[PDB]
Amino acid sequence: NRAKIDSTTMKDPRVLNNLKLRELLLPKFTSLWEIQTEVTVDNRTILLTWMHLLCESFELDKSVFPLSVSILDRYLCKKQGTKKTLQKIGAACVLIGSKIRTVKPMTVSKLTYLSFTNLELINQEKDILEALKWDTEAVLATDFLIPLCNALKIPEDLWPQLYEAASTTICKALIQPNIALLSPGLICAGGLLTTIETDNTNCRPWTCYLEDLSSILNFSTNTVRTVKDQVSEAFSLYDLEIL
Amino acid sequence: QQYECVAEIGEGAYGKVFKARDLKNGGRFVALKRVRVQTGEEGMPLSTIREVAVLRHLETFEHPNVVRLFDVCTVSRETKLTLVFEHVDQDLTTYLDKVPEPGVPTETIKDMMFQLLRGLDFLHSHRVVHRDLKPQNILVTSSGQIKLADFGLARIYSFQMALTSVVVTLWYRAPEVLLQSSYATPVDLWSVGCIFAEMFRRKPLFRGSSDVDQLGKILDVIGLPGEEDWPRDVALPRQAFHAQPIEKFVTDIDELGKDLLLKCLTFNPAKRISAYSALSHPYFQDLER
Ligand SMILES: O=c1c(O)c(-c2ccc(O)c(O)c2)oc2cc(O)ccc12
């Protein structure tokens, strides 16, 4: 498989302005899984640990898991889910998410053998799509990594390694419910800072882009730091013993 | 259920594309792209999903140069997935024929090439790559407006993302693609160039039979690159092959335009002009714009 390299027109202009823009197009207005009356947040944290495990194990593109979570939350704003139904609902979000953001899709057999019939998953993928009016795609926390590095003037020869870790921790951080509040733009920043920190990549003290990030994302500096602390938290709270 | 199929207007690969009427508006014509979702076991076809996803994700922007997606019909009865788009009077290949001699007027070919670059600038500015540009995928309205269509292969392009070994008919595939290397937004610039060079002379600029013949036809024009513009990544050497004036192929092209057609048909992708800068290029200095 041929992985993609830098494209100066895709990640060097004012793609950032547009990412910030497209971000503010999924207004929040409602709480996390607010409507659900039978599944809780702790159920989400669990479900998400299994989805994260699925995407990591199968080496799917870093963008799959955070698109899967997006679908899942959105869908659970319009339809009800039951305790014995989440696993399948989530399976289906990974199916959809992977079909889009990665070259070799996660098949139905791969998700069934892991739990429904290979026709129960299918009617689930369907019920999710109609629910979202097929409006599947979205702005992912993971989308900001490069744009921010560039805007932050971080040197390109670092990008690959910097990107590699940043993505990983951000994915683990998204498992935590406290992060679903934050916007993908901030969630990313915090993730970059966190990665920059616990691994000096010849990057001036992580506490340098602290401003640029603020001037860039338009929030203050207390905001960016707070987020850096949160993502680092969500990251450490990641624990397989919940499965 | 309420769409009376009038006639096929070309068929894709996983489903034909019929033009139909509907009881929604008098006799309104909406483009119908119905995909055969055979009950294999994979669920909804990936293509159908990416496409609708992308289109549906930017719609709010109501960009002029992007085709509009009306609806998605699905009968659970295999299952039949019918995607309903807007209907334009004809695609570009159809226009590039029914045009009186001697072809399209040098100014009309400039106004579409602009509109065509306006869709890509938009697309790319949102990290999207329409990996399948070709005359058949461009909708030309009677009014003269240009619409990009068939986002079947379109996808949100992110760093270190893995890539499939194939896309773009052939006569529009970019060298890097024909070589089995990485790729990105530049692929569409190569196509736009091919489509640009194709608007003057009403016929494909690089019609080839295979990967070697196509790669050779392409080079047979731009000329063998330099040991610095060939992938160090993989495949056939640059020796694998052994610089004719671009006009010799494009029946009379303006010195500034002929300069643009080459900026798009640049072998090394990183040196290939971007749709952004392309809308700034001198070849557009004076259009009704
Ligand atoms: O009016 C047309 C149209 O809307 C589409 C179209 C729209 C969305 C797609 O995804 C697609 O593959 C084709 O094609 C065409 C092809 C022709 O020869 C002529 C007219 C149209």
Q: What is the 3-state secondary structure (H, E, C) of chain B?
A: CCEEEEEEEEECCCCEEEEEEECCCCCCCEEEEEEEECCCCCCCCHHHHHHHHHHHHHHHHCCCCECCEEEEEEECCCEEEEEEEECCCEEHHHHCCCCCCCCCCCCHHHHHHHHHHHHHHHHHHCCEECCCCCHHHEEECCCCCEEECCCCCCEECCCCCEECCCCCCCCCCCHHHHCCCCCCCHHHHHHHHHHHHHHHCCCCCCCCCCHHHHHHHHHHHHCCCCCCCCCCCCCCCCCCCCCCCHHHCCCCCCCCHHHHHHHHCCCCHHHCCCHHHHCCCHHHCCCCC
Question: Which CATH number goes with the domain that contains B210?
Answer: 1.10.510.10
Does residue B289 fall inside a structural domain?
no
B11 is in an annotated binding site: yes
Ligand 1, pocket-test mutation among B6, B17, B82, B130, most atoms within 8 A of CB: B17
CA distance A116 to A88: 7
B79-86, strands of its sheet edge to edge = B3-11, B16-22, B30-37, B79-86, B69-75
Q: Are residues B70 and B142 in the same domain?
A: no
| A27 touches B at CB < 8 Å | no
Q: Are residues B83 and B161 in the same domain?
A: no
Pairing of strands B69-75, B30-37: unpaired
Q: Are residues B29 and B56 in the same domain?
A: yes
Alpha-carbon Rg for chain B, nearest whole angstrom, is 20
Contact between A137 and B58 under an 8 Å Cβ cutoff? The reply is no
Total domains, chain B: 2
Experimental method: X-ray
Ligand 1 atom at shortest distance from the alpha carbon of B12: 12
CA distance B237 to B287: 43
Q: How many angstroms does the Cα of residue B147 sit away from the middle of ligand 1?
A: 10
Report cis status (omega within 30 of 0) of the bond before B102: yes
Select from B56, B126, B156 the Cβ nearest to the Cβ of A18. Answer: B126
Q: Are residues B96 and B69 in the same domain?
A: no
- Residue B79: what are its φ and ψ, rounded to 5°? -110, 150
Cα–Cα separations (whole angstroms), residue B234 to A103, B182, B208, B231, B238: 20, 10, 22, 6, 11
Q: Are residues B32 and B175 in the same domain?
A: no
Give the contacts of A233 (CB within 8 A, at least 6 positions apart).
A176, A178
CA distance A1 to A11: 22
| B271 touches A at CB < 8 Å | no
CA distance A128 to A89: 8
Domain enclosing residue B211, as ranges? 90-283
Cα–Cα separations (whole angstroms), residue B68 to A19, B59, B154, B280: 22, 8, 15, 27
Residue A212: count other Cβ atoms within 10 Å of its Cβ: 15
> How would you class A7 by CB atoms within 10 Å of its CB: exposed for 0-12, middle for 13-18, buried for 19 or more?
buried
Give the contacts of A97 (CB within 8 A, at least 6 positions apart).
A64, A65, A67, A68, A70, A71
CA neighbours within 13 Å on the CB side: how many for B32?
A: 22
Q: Are residues B22 and B78 in the same domain?
A: yes
Does residue B84 fall inside a structural domain?
yes
Contact between B68 and B85 under an 8 Å Cβ cutoff? The reply is yes
Cα end-to-end distance, chain A, whole Å: 32
- Residue A200: what are its φ and ψ, rounded to 5°? -65, 110
Residue with the two structure tokens 């319009």: A78
Nearest to A176 by CA among A240, A243, A230: A230
Residues of B in contact with A118 (CB under 8 A): 41
Contact between A39 and A86 under an 8 Å Cβ cutoff? The reply is yes
- Minimum Cα–Cα distance from B121: chain A residue: A9
Amino acid at the residue B147: K
Q: Are residues B71 and B135 in the same domain?
A: no
CA distance A178 to A186: 13
Alpha-carbon Rg for chain A, nearest whole angstrom, is 18
Q: How many angstroms does the Cα of residue B258 sit away from the middle of ligand 1?
A: 29
Give the contacts of B25 (CB within 8 A, at least 6 positions apart).
none
Does residue B95 fall inside a structural domain?
yes
| B256 touches A at CB < 8 Å | no
Give the burial string for A66-103 (b: 16+ CB within 10 Å, else e): bbbbbbbbbbbbeeebeeeebbbbbbbbbbbbbbbbbb
Q: Are residues B121 and B237 in the same domain?
A: yes
Pairing of strands B30-37, B146-148: unpaired
Q: Are residues B171 and B248 in the same domain?
A: yes
Instruction: Give the angle B268-B271-B275 at the CA atoms, nearest 5°.
Output: 115
Token pair listed for A206 = 């992580």
- Regarding the beta carbon of B150 and ligand 1, being less than 6 Å apart is answered yes
B16 is in an annotated binding site: yes
Token pair listed for B103 = 């072809």
Nearest to A79 by CA among A114, A29, A117, A37: A37
CA distance A88 to A47: 10
Q: Are residues B268 and B221 in the same domain?
A: yes
Does residue B288 fall inside a structural domain?
no
Q: Are residues B94 and B56 in the same domain?
A: no
CA distance A216 to B2: 50
CA distance B248 to A55: 52
The residue from B46, B69, B89 where one domain ends is: B89
Long-range interactions of A44-47: CB distance < 8 A, separation 24+: A44/A177, A45/A175, A45/A176, A45/A177, A45/A242, A46/A242, A46/A243, A47/A72, A47/A86, A47/A87, A47/A90
Window A:73-132, CB contacts with B under 8 Å? 95-96, 99-105, 107-109, 118, 121-122, 125-126, 129-130
DSSP classification of residue A39: -
Rounded to 10 degrees, what is the CA torsion of B266, B272, B276, B280? Answer: -60
Q: How many angstroms does the Cα of residue B35 sit away from the middle of ligand 1?
A: 13
B14 is in an annotated binding site: yes
CA distance A63 to A191: 15
Q: How many angstroms does the Cα of residue A25 sit away from the middle of ligand 1?
A: 28
Token pair listed for B167 = 């896309």
Nearest to B165 by CA among A97, A103, A101, A61: A103
Question: Which CATH number goes with the domain that contains B70?
Answer: 3.30.200.20
Q: Closest Cα of chain A to B39: distance in Å?
A: 9
Contact between B4 and B20 under an 8 Å Cβ cutoff? The reply is yes
Q: Is B132 a catalytic site residue?
A: yes
CA distance B274 to B140: 23
Q: Kindly list the structural domains of chain A, giving each domain's residue range(s) and its CATH number in brackets, ordered by start.
A: 29-137 (1.10.472.10), 138-243 (1.10.472.10)
- Residue B202: what are its φ and ψ, rounded to 5°? -70, 50
Q: Are residues B111 and B154 in the same domain?
A: yes
Considering only CA atoms, which residue is closest to atom 10 of ligand 1? B150
Dihedral of alpha carbons A45, A148, B174, B237, sign: negative
